[PDB]
Design a protein around this ligand. Sequence first.
Ligand SMILES: O=C(CCc1nc2ccccc2c(=O)[nH]1)N[C@H](CO)Cc1ccccc1
Length: 353
Amino acid sequence: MKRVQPCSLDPATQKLITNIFSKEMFKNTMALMDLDVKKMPLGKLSKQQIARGFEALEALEEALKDGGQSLEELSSHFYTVIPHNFGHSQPPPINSPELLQAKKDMLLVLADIELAQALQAVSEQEKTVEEVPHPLDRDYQLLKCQLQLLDSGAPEYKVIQTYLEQTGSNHRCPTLQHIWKVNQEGEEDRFQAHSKLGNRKLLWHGTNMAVVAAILTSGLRIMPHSGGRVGKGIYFASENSKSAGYVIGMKCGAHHVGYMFLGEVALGREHHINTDNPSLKSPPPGFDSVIARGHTEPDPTQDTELELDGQQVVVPQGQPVPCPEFSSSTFSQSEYLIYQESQCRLRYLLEVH
Ligand SMILES: O=C(CCc1nc2ccccc2c(=O)[nH]1)N[C@H](CO)Cc1ccccc1
């Protein structure tokens, strides 16, 4: 019989680690994406199954752009591969660009749930050693990501807080519970690459709870099939309220809990757009980033800076104001895009209620 060593983690970190590997959270997330968890249990999810789902969607995408299979028939093949639940009614046909991307976005979420399952697989060393870490220490270590909980007088705390409060929703701003500094090493070497690239900004990336572990483990990624209004890159916001839109928020006791990242993004020379372009896969030549400019922007006169690994990083601190030059933009709020994973380094994780 093996000894379980005592947990080394502070309370807030233990809760985080509990939340982001929770089987309940994962099944909840699946149910909310209309998946049939009884026909697709967590332990049954495979890379192969997900791979076959993307093949099914690629066949649908081809048909949507000659005597081939109908949309109904190719949809029915997708649903055999990826079981959906719609109260045992038939599931609906995937017959629009918008519906196709939605199913691609579901599968990207499902792939990160599977990643978290695979990550947890018990290694052979773990079966032979006579003492095991506390389960939360084990799950934390699996991330290969250092998290340090910040207190009230850490030098960046008030800056982060102010960013959150000034750019979050005016009426029900998310309430800050905790901030962790995130050091995922081996984001470090690729990010050093862009050392001479100026114009760094600390930016929001909101996501659902089911992909936080994957992100902590592998960073923000551009996956085949990633997409959206500014194409195939990694999306950020200067306004917390835009990013908060993507935080599902899991019910725990009397409140909702959710998680948001702050990434240091090396934007370099910016290309500004004012109309949607879902077909972008890089900035134009000689640009390092694409900013889909909002009707509003956090008041640039209130921008401050932080020093992170020797470099100045802009942090907005102002309430959003109007930008007359982009008053007719298709975007109400800015979307900041990079098209290389190495241009972002995760820096903070926030818990918000
Ligand atoms: O959860 C996200 C990040 C979404 C996100 N999009 C933004 C777009 C513009 C500006 C900011 C954000 C942002 O903070 N998060 N991506 C998922 C894969 O990790 C796939 C997905 C995409 C859309 C809705 C739900 C899930």
